[PDB]
Design an enzyme around this catalytic site. Structure first.
Site, short mmCIF file in Angstrom:
data_model
loop_
_atom_site.label_atom_id
_atom_site.label_comp_id
_atom_site.label_asym_id
_atom_site.label_seq_id
_atom_site.Cartn_x
_atom_site.Cartn_y
_atom_site.Cartn_z
N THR A 192 38.46 13.25 30.57
CA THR A 192 39.65 12.99 29.77
C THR A 192 39.32 13.11 28.28
O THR A 192 38.16 13.00 27.88
CB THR A 192 40.21 11.57 30.03
OG1 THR A 192 39.45 10.60 29.29
CG2 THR A 192 40.14 11.24 31.51
N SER A 193 40.35 13.33 27.46
CA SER A 193 40.16 13.46 26.02
C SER A 193 39.62 12.15 25.47
O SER A 193 40.06 11.08 25.86
CB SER A 193 41.49 13.81 25.37
OG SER A 193 41.32 14.08 23.99
N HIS A 195 30.94 11.92 26.54
CA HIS A 195 30.94 11.35 27.88
C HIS A 195 29.51 11.48 28.40
O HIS A 195 28.67 12.13 27.79
CB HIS A 195 31.87 12.13 28.81
CG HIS A 195 33.32 11.84 28.62
ND1 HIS A 195 33.86 10.58 28.76
CD2 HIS A 195 34.37 12.66 28.33
CE1 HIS A 195 35.17 10.63 28.57
NE2 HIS A 195 35.50 11.89 28.31
N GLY A 196 29.24 10.85 29.54
CA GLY A 196 27.92 10.95 30.12
C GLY A 196 27.75 10.12 31.37
O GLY A 196 28.70 9.47 31.82
N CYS A 217 28.81 6.76 28.56
CA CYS A 217 28.83 6.22 29.92
C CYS A 217 27.46 6.54 30.48
O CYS A 217 26.88 7.59 30.19
CB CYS A 217 29.98 7.02 30.53
SG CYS A 217 31.29 6.41 29.47
C1 LIG Z 1 32.78 7.41 29.61
O1 LIG Z 1 32.43 8.58 29.23
C2 LIG Z 1 33.45 7.62 30.98
S1 LIG Z 1 32.37 8.50 32.12
C3 LIG Z 1 33.41 8.68 33.58
C4 LIG Z 1 32.73 9.50 34.67
C5 LIG Z 1 31.82 10.55 34.30
C6 LIG Z 1 31.17 11.34 35.28
C7 LIG Z 1 31.42 11.10 36.65
C8 LIG Z 1 32.32 10.07 37.04
C9 LIG Z 1 32.97 9.27 36.05
C10 LIG Z 1 33.71 6.72 28.57
C11 LIG Z 1 32.97 6.42 27.22
C12 LIG Z 1 33.47 7.22 26.02
O2 LIG Z 1 34.16 8.19 26.18
O3 LIG Z 1 33.17 6.87 24.90
N1 LIG Z 1 34.31 5.50 29.02
C13 LIG Z 1 35.63 5.46 29.14
O4 LIG Z 1 36.40 6.44 28.90
C14 LIG Z 1 36.23 4.12 29.55
C15 LIG Z 1 36.14 3.72 31.09
C16 LIG Z 1 37.47 4.22 31.54
C17 LIG Z 1 38.29 4.44 30.47
C18 LIG Z 1 39.63 4.96 30.61
C19 LIG Z 1 40.08 5.21 31.94
C20 LIG Z 1 39.22 4.96 33.05
C21 LIG Z 1 37.91 4.46 32.86
C22 LIG Z 1 40.49 5.25 29.36
C23 LIG Z 1 40.62 4.28 28.17
C24 LIG Z 1 39.67 3.10 28.16
N2 LIG Z 1 39.88 2.23 27.01
C25 LIG Z 1 40.84 1.30 27.02
O5 LIG Z 1 41.64 1.07 27.98
C26 LIG Z 1 40.91 0.43 25.75
C27 LIG Z 1 40.26 -0.94 26.07
C28 LIG Z 1 40.25 -1.92 24.90
O6 LIG Z 1 39.82 -1.57 23.82
O7 LIG Z 1 40.66 -3.05 25.06
N3 LIG Z 1 42.31 0.28 25.32
C29 LIG Z 1 42.93 1.19 24.53
C30 LIG Z 1 44.39 0.83 24.21
O8 LIG Z 1 42.40 2.26 24.07
C31 LIG Z 1 38.19 3.52 28.15
O9 LIG Z 1 37.51 3.28 27.11
N4 LIG Z 1 37.68 4.11 29.29
#
Ligand SMILES: *[C@@](=O)([C]S[C]C1=[C][C]=[C][C]=[C]1)[C]([C]C([O])=O)[N]C(=O)[C]1[C]C2=C3C(=[C][C]=[C]2)[C][C][C]([N]C(=O)[C]([C]C([O])=O)[N]C([C])=O)C(=O)N13
Ligand SMILES: *[C@@](=O)([C]S[C]C1=[C][C]=[C][C]=[C]1)[C]([C]C([O])=O)[N]C(=O)[C]1[C]C2=C3C(=[C][C]=[C]2)[C][C][C]([N]C(=O)[C]([C]C([O])=O)[N]C([C])=O)C(=O)N13
EC number: 3.4.22.56
Lengths: 91, 140, 91, 140
Positions: free
Chosen positions: D29-30, D88-89, D130
């Protein structure tokens, strides 16, 4: 509320994927140095800093000696893995 | 505060697992000199006021059981926890006299939600072991 | 002569095997905290200690908010991996 | 001395790799909000006297090439090296806009025997990523 993986600390004798060295007469390089640094510093340095001293000692004063050329003159660098949230003083 | 509270009635427990001899099945050589470390470590942590408990040549089963048991003790009056592992290993693993055991399985007992009396207290793991068979030839 | 893997330091946003969190409006928790701690402390604390402050901040002041119950109210603990041999001061 | 020498004519180089958008092939995802970090980091290290270079949306190929190139620059007048990775990672890996690249491959260029002008100098890697999909629910 805090992370369940917090307040852990892993002091590794060596870096990831590497051998760790030990002398049959004096013991492992890492442990020798750790005990020595703790002896003279546990009363004044914060734990991370003591471990940093261990890193320098192990990395500077040790070098393997082996009749086997392939395991001869090798080095080693300990690895600190901290997930602590506060400074650590043994006093 | 930016430093842990080390003024509990007890500094804490310090387990030293000293593996020196291994079953032929494992294929690991005897760990000569490990006793010096064990003795050295024991004395060093006694002067730091830690309750030291030395263990020699344990099987992977015994190590897991011991940790489990130690994680179940009550540490409320203790400031910290220290566990020294002296043995063979590879990345993410440490050897019992009878075979490999995942490092994750040992520490998991001490997670914040598993060992409540240690929550918010420093848990130190000192590992003397191989994390692979790569050699650092040095430079300069 | 020194180890070729020495003098390296890996500041990880999270622990091994875990997700790392980021807020779409403010940025990642880890980076926010790191920059903040560096702003007010780069002039007096040694680097490890600054990173320890980051650990507490990330572990204490952050908690995910998600409409999705499975990603809601989660925590995070940064991970310091040091193989440095000397203390680090930016001044 | 028990502290690095930070009085070289130049504090050092600071590369920031900011990956925000990924190819559909990756399935990532972006990374919204990463720009704030990139901007924040840039300003923070400029005040520390680091020569900052920001890079956005790089492929794994570009990342490797860049590091290779940076490892080949002459750092004799520089005190340290800082590389920030925003992406990501998973454990031991970080993503380029077009796919995974091993973290080992990036840092290896800076080993003591590979990048001679940085030998004995601090090499800092800051990674925002990650390292898996495990969730920490918290305690107490
Ligand atoms: C990781 O890269 C995710 S690796 C996923 C994966 C990779 C390979 C094989 C299987 C799975 C990132 C870190 C980064 O990009 O910096 N973590 C996330 O994106 C996390 C975990 C996650 C998120 C989301 C959806 C599902 C899992 C999207 C948004 C989410 N953040 C929030 O919801 C925040 C939380 C807060 O601050 O309270 N709220 C808002 C409004 O932004 C998120 O960070 N990630
Ligand atoms: C590791 O456990 C080895 S893991 C090997 C392995 C495991 C699984 C799958 C494949 C391979 C140990 C650490 C420990 O026990 O504490 N490292 C060693 O045993 C190292 C590396 C090595 C050694 C030896 C033979 C082959 C590889 C034996 C002795 C050697 N030490 C010395 O030669 C020292 C060096 C010095 O101090 O100068 N000299 C003396 C006289 O003792 C050694 O440590 N290891």
């Amino acid at each position: 509320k805090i992370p369940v993986e917090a307040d852990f600390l892993y002091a590794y004798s060596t870096a990831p994927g590497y051998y760790s060295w030990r002398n049959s007469k004096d013991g492992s390089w890492f442990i020798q140095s750790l005990c020595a640094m703790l002896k003279q510093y546990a009363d004044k340095l914060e734990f991370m800093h003591i471990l940093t001293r261990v890193n320098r000692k192990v990395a500077t004063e040790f070098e393997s000696f082996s009749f086997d050329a392939t395991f001869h003159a090798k080095k080693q660098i300990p690895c600190i893995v901290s997930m602590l949230t506060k400074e650590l003083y043994f006093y | 505060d930016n430093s842990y509270k080390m003024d509990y009635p007890e500094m804490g427990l310090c387990i030293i697992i000293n593996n020196k001899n291994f079953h032929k099945s494992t294929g690991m050589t005897s760990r000569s000199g490990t006793d010096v470390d064990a003795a050295n470590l024991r004395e060093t942590f006694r002067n730091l006021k830690y309750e030291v408990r030395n263990k020699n040549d344990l099987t992977r089963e015994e190590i897991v059981e011991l940790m489990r048991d130690v994680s179940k003790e009550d540490h409320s009056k203790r400031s910290s926890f220290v566990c020294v592992l002296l043995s063979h290993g590879e990345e993410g693993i440490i050897f019992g006299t009878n075979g490999p055991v995942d490092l994750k399985k040992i520490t998991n007992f001490f997670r914040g939600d598993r060992c409540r009396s240690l929550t918010g207290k420093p848990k130190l793991f000192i590992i003397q072991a191989c994390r692979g068979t790569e050699l650092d030839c040095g430079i300069e």
